[PDB]
Paper text:
The intrinsic pathway to apoptosis is regulated by interactions between members of three factions of the Bcl-2 protein family: the BH3-only proteins such as Bim and Bid, which initiate the process, the essential effectors Bax and Bak, and the prosurvival members, which oppose the action of both other factions. Bim and Bid are both potent direct activators of Bax, but Bim is less dependent on interactions via its ‘h0' residues than is Bid.
α2 in equivalent complexes, we crystallised a core/latch dimer complex of BaxI66AΔC21 with BidBH3. In addition, a slight ‘collapse' of Bax α2 towards the core of the complex is evident in a 1 Å shortening of the distance between the Cα atoms of Bid M97 and Bax I66A (8.2 Å) as compared with Bax I66 (9.3 Å). As a consequence, the cavity in the BidBH3:BaxI66AΔC21 structure is reduced to a size not significantly larger than cavities found (for example) in the interior of the complex between BimBH3 and Bcl-xL.
Author numbering:
A (entry chain A), C (entry chain A): 10 to 37, 44 to 167
B (entry chain C), D (entry chain C): 76 to 99
Write the structure that this text describes.
């Protein structure tokens, strides 16, 4: 047992809202199993989503966020988190802003991962092509033969 | 580096400011 | 020097088409620097794109592709590649299909990476929240306080 | 596993078939 004021309920609900929120923004195929939740928690998810949408239309923020280097993203996360709350104040807007920042690190890490995956997979593909297909492709007179094949 | 430290403080202050303003 | 039939031109153009093609499909924020190319190579890119689009509307294929497990994606790539060309035949359509398969492994790897990133970043965020913000959140009577804050 | 081997052969045959058909 334990009401909304218990540390357990706070961590539990906190996990749900944050995951709901990050998954939501990271969807904008291969999608994610949405986070099942109650009526009040949906109402909260809904509102977080709106605040996040409004943050996305803040061009200053998006500029600086894209500007920052996420080679060591954990360092960045903790440095920003600490700086945000260092003046000893707390309010709901900063908590929301923190959640927003977390979702942006996800996207940012994802962005650096994409060209890595591509290069790796291209490596396999071009290795296969060179050792198995090159002979046949030369027989066509190179990729100019694919032009003919498409009609162009 | 030294400028990245600046961008990070910046992001923080901005996030804190946006959060202070989400009230009204 | 070396015309379209040279192995050098074949590997070089091959790299360009494949990268162009994979990046194209992986875009459907944080986008990718497009691959600069000549008129003939653009014509080729254009056509590959169309064939890929037509492959995406092949529900059989998409079903099986999503069905396959990419724990060891290199193994999968080479097993499929070998099987596709094992009857000793070659044509342009199989080469296109191979490229298509490569782009799908990219998306598939990306999909498994997303929930990993999210969990990691949520770990940092919930760690910060529990040690730095929990007290204040309890003072609000838990997340029910965020409801009040949003007006609900 | 043994069924994954089946799904893989399947994907291959299908890709090969789709590629043979891209002609006309």
């Amino acid at each position: 047992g334990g009401g909304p004021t218990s540390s357990e309920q706070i961590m539990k609900t906190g996990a749900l809202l944050l995951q709901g929120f990050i998954q939501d923004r990271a969807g904008r195929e291969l999608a994610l199993d949405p986070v099942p939740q109650d009526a009040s928690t949906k109402k909260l998810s809904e509102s977080l989503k709106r605040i996040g949408d409004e943050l996305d239309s803040n061009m200053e923020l998006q500029r600086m966020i894209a500007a920052v280097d996420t080679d060591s993203p954990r360092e960045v996360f903790f440095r920003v988190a600490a700086d945000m709350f260092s003046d000893g104040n707390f309010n709901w807007g900063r908590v929301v802003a923190l959640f927003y920042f977390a979702s942006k690190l996800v996207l940012k890490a994802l962005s650096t991962k994409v060209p890595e995956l591509i290069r790796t997979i291209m490596g396999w593909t071009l290795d296969f092509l060179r050792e198995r297909l090159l002979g046949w492709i030369q027989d066509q007179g190179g990729w100019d033969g694919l032009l003919s094949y498409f009609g162009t | 580096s030294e400028s990245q430290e600046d961008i990070i403080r910046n992001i923080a202050r901005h996030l804190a400011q946006v959060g202070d303003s989400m009230d009204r």
